[model samples]
Target chain A: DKHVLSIQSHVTHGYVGNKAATFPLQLHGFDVDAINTVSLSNHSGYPVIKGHRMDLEEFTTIMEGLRANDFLSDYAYVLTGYINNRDIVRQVAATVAEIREARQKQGKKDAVFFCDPVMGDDGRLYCKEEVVEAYRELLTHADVATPNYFEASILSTVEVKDLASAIEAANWFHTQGTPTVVIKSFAMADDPTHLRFLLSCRDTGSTKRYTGVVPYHEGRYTGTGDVFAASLVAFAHSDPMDLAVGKAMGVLQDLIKATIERRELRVTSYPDRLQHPSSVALVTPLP
Target chain B: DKHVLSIQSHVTHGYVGNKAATFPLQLHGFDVDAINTVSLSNHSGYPVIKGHRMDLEEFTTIMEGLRANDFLSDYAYVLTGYINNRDIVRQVAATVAEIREARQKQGKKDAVFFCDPVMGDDGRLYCKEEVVEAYRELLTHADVATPNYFEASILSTVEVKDLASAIEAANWFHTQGTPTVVIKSFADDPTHLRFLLSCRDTGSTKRYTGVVPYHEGRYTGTGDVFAASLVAFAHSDPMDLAVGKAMGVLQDLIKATIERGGSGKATLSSRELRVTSYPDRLQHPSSVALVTPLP
Candidate 1:
């Protein structure tokens, strides 16, 4: 079976963070698989966010048993979502390394790693700076690294700066050893109104500035990052990287904006933007 | 305009080959750009494959013009087919390097490079060792490299024994600093009747195997080479390397020819593959055996 596996905690918010986007992959016909990084009984919206991460040592234990017992092979796509801490990042990285080495040893070479550095969003830092640093190291091991405009800026040390400088900063991040680095939801000079986005692909060095704006209407959905990360992996299966980036960027943008519109209309209880994304703008680099 | 430029020559052959592929891209609305390496009046199809190597300096003169005029910077996709010599390889590499450096300097990563080491058909080196060696070096600088089983083996230092070896070879090719490597048409266990196909990107490994079917008189160009090259470029456009390999190989089986049907037309007809029907030529059957890392 084709599986798209995701790992996250049990909290209401973080629980579905990746699941919403991952569901579309299955809808699009992929056997999906997931593993929770942490199991939390609380949401970040609570008085306080509280949860317990998985056993760092046991991260690969489950995968090891799967491999040792002769199961868990032939998965074309594997995606990683948010981890609460740096130690967990190390565990995930080590696990991916071991599996990749094993795949190479087994003579397989078609699997891919799509990492979402979920340490920050909305122009704020969430993880300890130490974990942020660790994501940089882990990014080296990933085939595709997707950081939203905010996280990309922090990584590049150009947060809240202009798009050109941000593009330069993003390019610097791409040089960190990942072949493709995407600064998602990047503001563009053409888009001072937050309607257009600029995506720079490292491998091709092609920067596509997507136009058209989404209407941002309502409540903040905490799980969008998870959806965006999962969308990157799943879409990569059906589309090209630029197309995947476009789709993921478009879907997330619309999901957020449309959901907000729905809340304003009061047609839905939860803002659809936060809980789900509605469309994918399939844009290609000018040929 | 972001043009699809073909830096090739058998002047007539290159022109025709690229034209066929270009037609489809234009139909799909992509700007077409052409750069002739040698303006020979005819193709080698007549005099038993004889053609003069355009002086490498002369070849780069045009390339230099592109660079000087900023056309290379505007290049969205570059499709390279046949370069007759190592010096030409050096010239081309230098040209691409200049563009890459410009992109780096501008802090703007731009353009995709697709290299097709058009040498050899089955189990033998068709070009001089220098030609082969130059391709190996050139591949390092490409975002995606497409080499058939024979070519991939030459580059990866592996014996073209069977499919497993080819997969091993593809995996080895990946260690050479490219984001993705596509080793095409690998034959693994002849007795098992399986052909091994692999694409490597980052740390993930994905594989596909096709049950071998012996077809008579498959002839030259069996859609073997050209299709793989386009597949490489198409993938790097939107997908990561591994996924590109998976999609490209799968489509090759049931894939449509840029010109002819089922007669290896797509691979042999360079003119068509490169210029006429490339945009929609990837049509394949659903019978491919796909394998990926165990989940």
Candidate 2:
């Protein structure tokens, strides 16, 4: 049974975090079980907000219940995104460690932990300053991690204004022992019309970068990064790491284009697209 | 945007309740938001179950949080299944009433509430006796309700040993104000393995029955799947047509399960039941299987 445990935020009315990621994973043939860290009426982009962000106690209790039921070991993969508290991050890290240990004892291969350190994007940090430090500790335990350019800069403390500096920031994560680091939404000053993504895979000891021209789009949308991280994990599970990253970016480009055209991402419309191979041009390896 | 709020049990490892129901609804083009009453490692049929059934406070708080955010009005339909607690049922009834009032104020049609009274089956009650009373209250608010033969007998306080008695029991639910009642698994005699779905539509003042050759398989959550499909079809079509389409889908799903070695659960990934592959069947319902009218 292909299983993925997705720990993320759930919004009742919009596609954000698990709401955005779970359906796509299901379409891709993984049985996804979610542990929601928050339940909001909609994403924070709305004017009025109402929801509950799970406190450390609620998080610990839910994890303990899953552990007691022996539910943690059956997963082939565990993914996390958009945790707002430091204590919850520590608890999740512990839970991931427990799951990995259990899978090892059961004679299964190590469960891949894909951590999307969702602090903020664009130019501002949406979470507390200390959360970046917390994510640094959590990334040390993950097999794969995705951080956008801003988050990579925050976690690595490197200024990432261009392609070379983005690679420098990704290398900082590699030094911290995360085997795969995907630096998403990197912009090079030299080519403003192209947004680049860099995949640094320590598994093969090689770094590759994929670049796509920036589409003319405006206005903020939730869950684009979430869709990318989930698609990457699903693809990387079976294919070569570099090809997985390229295919995932190819798929996301199509979804983004569709979303921009409609001014909304009705994820349900794209199940056919997701089930098929990427039709967009593949991103070749960096020489 | 088509949306349904599914309140049911969530298990990490099995296809039951919301797990069995969500994908099919999504395949049929409804966005699903789930409120999990219990979070278990797997279904209760397994040797071990580890999870928490939400206490009343937590349940009330979550409902209130959703209500405060005005999320309840967006749904055209709401479905509930396998609630094991009585107090939670009472709270849900109140919430359904609140949602109906909200929809009325918004100048939208009353949001359809489909209640699957999941107390028990096969001649015994699986839940506490108080749960039966709780369901009586909740049924009053529901626009559409599905009760299997045993649950129908209990709620109507009538013996459901034949077609006449089953219709009588369904009529009792109509008296309680639910407009549509689907009495699943009604049989004319003890020897017949034929599964009959007795649908009574008060809106049309007519009753219809459909029979399928019962596959002799033991499974726990097929009823949840049936309820979800019924809600989806009912939202998109008329009452009698909805019941017919839902039964056709149910039969195909069961056949898929038996073909897959009878894993004791109906998977949502059954190729035969996917909407994309069977768009023709969905478009022309009776072409798949006919639900003949009963005199």
Candidate 3:
């Protein structure tokens, strides 16, 4: 079984955070054990918000319970998003480090940690000021990091305006010790209609980029990044890194296009589409 | 999308409570919203348990949040299992009532609540004394009620020994106002090696019964597995055939678990049950039993 521990926010009404990430992973054949960092009635994109965060103490207790039962090892991946606080970030980093060490000792050297440093988007920081440093610290141990241009700017402390600047920002995460960096939804300064996603790896010292020109459609959509990250993890396990990102992007774009009201992805209605990618967005390799 | 809200216990490492219920419902194509009453490291069957229950205040807060945001309506079903406290039970009953009222006002009359009155099994009451009254109150508003033999005994205050006693007890739930009653795991005699299931519907004033060879397996979460299948297939078939399909699915699950060494935990992914074409086989099940049509 491909076991993954998804630590993220859960919204009852819409898909975002783990609510957004878990089903696709499960549909893609993952045994997901989700630890909700926040339980809200609906995603914050809604007009009203009602929920509670999993505090540091509660987080510690849950982790301790898993550890005491020796349930911490034997995970193929650990995916985290929208941690919301520095304290929780610190504990998550520690937990991921401990699991990696334990798995490595047990001879499963491929246990990977994927971090979607979900701080903010569209040139704004949604989280607190202190969380950027916490994310930087967290990404130091991350095997796979998926960050958008804004988050890449925050983590790498470099302005990302074009492909050159994007690669520079991505290389900054490489310097911080993340082996693989996937800069999701990268937009150049000149092209508002086109989006580029770049994957850079320090292990091979090579970078591959894919560009998809998505027309501007205006609506409040949640969970696209989450789907991308989740599908990236699933497809990356089976396919090569470049093909995986391309296929994951294809699946995300198809789902996004299928969502009519722009509230949430039509996930439950199109379970088959989630398992198989059809009508992929045109992704071309950029030299 | 058919939406279901499963309010139950969550275990990190075992296939019980929400762990047992949610996936099958999802596989059957319902968008399930899970509200965990408690989050334990593993099922209590394990030697050690480390978790805390969601207190009444927090429970009310989440429910109120859903209500305030208008997120509570539009559900096809509300499934309750193994609620550990009296206060949560009262709150759940209240929430179900409010949702039913809102749905009625909206003219979507098909919304139903399926309560798995999960207090105990075999011959014991695992819940507190106050919970019995709470379940009684909750069942008054439930559209479908699923109770095991022991829970049937408690709910009806009558000993459910055989088919007749099981039917009498199911009728008791009907008198309490549940339209459909599914008496799960009705063992007839002392040996307890054979099991029967009785589904009685007050609306049609009829009942159906089916039997299957019971395996004396030491496993938890079987009731949860039964409840999920019942709810899922009930949404697809009539009350009579829903019980048969659910029983068939349970039998398949038991065989799969037995094939895996009869461990306390079932496999996370059972492809046979998930992909099984269950609708046509409802009328003719593999573990077919005599169907006694009661007046």
Candidate 4:
């Protein structure tokens, strides 16, 4: 819980990618060692996207540094987001294994890999078909996976517009060896005012499902997935899995409300709100 | 400040450069837009250093994106640290001017650039002579400059061992057109450390000084922390008052670091600044080093 290897995007002007993820984790006292997969000026919502992108070579080069220093064992968790390259997506498994071996050799608990399969959104494809296959393979090693409706839909071939489909999508992750899965949000045909979420746990011998809903906001926000994933990593570390999902969703809600004013994710506005949300979604057993 | 463009080194493992500077600024609710001058695996003190260094082209490319997006006007403060390249060091003033111009057009107040000339420390030079000269040139455009004793000595060509020499060193900055200078610390006595603050209003000059217990051992990220807190406090308070609070942040930060296994003769790993361990100290440090007018 004290250390994390966060591979995400780095933006200069606003919070998105690592920008959105790092501060909230830092507030919880996690030493986040970030590897920026892409260094962009801002999120893609802006017209111009410019900065360095780390290919597989640079990615492994950074890993070389971490290994040389014997700091690999220090990481208790490995969290990745928004790496669209097929090669790099495949390589995260090796990184995760190295961290797992290092942590095991150091006599620590098994290191968790929280994978957020970031590709495509709302009927669009932002990554290659091969990258999607790469994610399917990577999920076999993932301890937890947080995929939005689009991601879950593509990954499991399950249309996640309702609870039954979301549960089926989450089951896809459990079969791939992910002990915990959060199908972050999906629309329900009956409920236009709220977005439904699923928290499925298979850590025990049997699988259990918890369901909740958050008010649907009109505009699309960048970094909601990144923020949700990072917050889940923090809260899920200590609290029960269901509660962590509820609270992380609440953190996202608070941030979206705050950002309705900044057009950027205003994560810094409420420091106290990261750990203690003003309102958290109420989780209940799936009926 | 609402927004900051922080140019600094970035490390993966520990707090230094942007890592040390960012959390404090974020704690103060600033949207810190960071340009990692060098993205290293860890600070240079580590066993093996690896990762990327942004060249002049990369630096300008980022500025290109910012300029193209029309987001340059959003920055109210610009803080720079640990850029050792001479070309990039010199190019910062250009970026500052670009930001200032954009802010001007947008009707925002002039952006403030806090320059930390991170060339050398304790009688050693980490940069080339060309880099030193570049800093000398850039200081003229910087609104506030924070230099440790060695940086002040080398930049001004004056040995800053005492207050008079420190003042002389500070005056060299005023002559070069920098309006405010904080010669962060000098060895006036073994028991206590003295820091000088010099603000020049073109014709008249005002100076204040303060002292603190010589926190044992060389803490790596103290200056980065100082510059960050200075910019944050200065956003709401006067320069002199800001330094006092900034100094208070250092005392608290150092003590926290030392307490978290970074005291005398500790391993470099143990000595890394415990920046995130205590957020309260960052917001309200207990030891406020009182600043007094130089009489």
Question: Per-candidate DockQ versus the true complex?
Answer: 0.01, 0.33, 0.43, 0.83
Q: How many Å off is the CA of A119 in candidate 2?
A: 2.0
Give per-residue CA lDDT, model 4, range A38-68, as digits (tens).
8878887799988888889888888988999
Steric clash pairs (candidate 2): none
DockQ for candidate 4: 0.83
Candidate maximizing DockQ: 4
Indicate the TM-score of model 4: 0.97
RMSD of each: 24.7, 3.9, 3.7, 1.5
Scored by Cα lDDT, where does model 1 land?
A: 0.53
Q: Model 1 reaches what TM-score against the true structure?
A: 0.44
> Against the correct fold, how does model 3 do in TM-score?
0.89
Q: Write the per-residue lDDT of candidate 1 for residues B30-136, one digit (tens) a residue.
A: 44444434333233332323223456665654555455445556556666766657888766677777767766666665767777666665676656688887887
Off by over 4 Å in 2: A55-71, A204-216, B55-70, B122-128, B159-161, B186-205, B263-289
lDDT by residue for model 3 (B1-295), tens: 3788888887656568886787677677788887778877776655567765787887887787778777677677999997778999888878887888877777776668889888887686778889999899888888888888888899899898877888788778888887777777665254333334444353555666657656654557777877887788778777666666677767766666566555435433332122122322322346633344554
Give the top-scoring candidate (TM-score).
4
| Per-candidate local distance difference test | 0.53, 0.74, 0.75, 0.90
lDDT, candidate 2, equals 0.74
In the order shown, the chain A TM-scores of the predictions are: 0.79, 0.93, 0.92, 0.97
lDDT for A68 in candidate 4 is 93
lDDT of candidate 1 over A1-287, digit per residue (tens)? 24544555433122254324433454344534445454332335444443345565545544543454333444455577677578778777766766666666778765677777777666667679988888888887877777777777777677534556656765666678666666555444654555334455654565444223343333556666566666677567667776676666666776565555541111112223322445665554432
Score residue A47 of candidate 4 by CA lDDT: 93
Report the C-alpha displacement of residue A110, candidate 4, in angstroms: 1.5
